């Protein structure tokens, strides 16, 4: 069973960003909970580490066990994406985010959502989410996402048969002339 929100939220981990290993224009809270895309002139430390194309950042803690629950504010922005993936994906190109290619993710992008799914699943909401909620359970396989907003469940991909280790991944998307620089920021459960 896919619980209700409710339910998920009883299992929240603290999720704090990798800024080792983000694409370099990213900016990060000191506190690393939030993340955003910076200028071309806004560059964080050059290393062989980091993704290359992909405006993506890892969090924190990788895990291969349980029940575990984080909420991501998104706001008022237009692009993002949100979800779980291995820790062994390839940085430097390499990925289509789908399942196969060890990514479960929901995204934002032109006024639309979907779930990564291969072909991608749009999905059909009417209350924009402000908050994400993303609940992995590693037993059963599932990932389920949640819009905290209206409290409703907006997909699970479900038979994953995750092996290895998981964890938090994350994109701010791209600037869109001015409307899409606000963070994602990693919220508690209030």
Sequence with gaps: NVPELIGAQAHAVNVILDAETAYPNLIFSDDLKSVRLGNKWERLPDGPQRF?????????????????????????????????CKTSISRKGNMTLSPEN???????????????????????????????????????????FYNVTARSHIYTFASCSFSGPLQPIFSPGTRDGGKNTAPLTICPVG
């Design 102 to 144: 060890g990514y479960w993710v929901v995204m934002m992008k032109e006024n639309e959502y979907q779930a990564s799914s291969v072909p991608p699943t749009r999905l059909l909401i009417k209350e924009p989410p402000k908050r994400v909620g993303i609940f992995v359970d590693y037993r059963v396989g599932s990932i389920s």
């Design 52 to 84: 290359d194309s992909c405006i993506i950042v890892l969090g924190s803690p990788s895990f291969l066990s349980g029940r575990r629950y984080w909420e991501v504010e998104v706001g008022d922005k237009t692009a993002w994406i949100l979800g779980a």
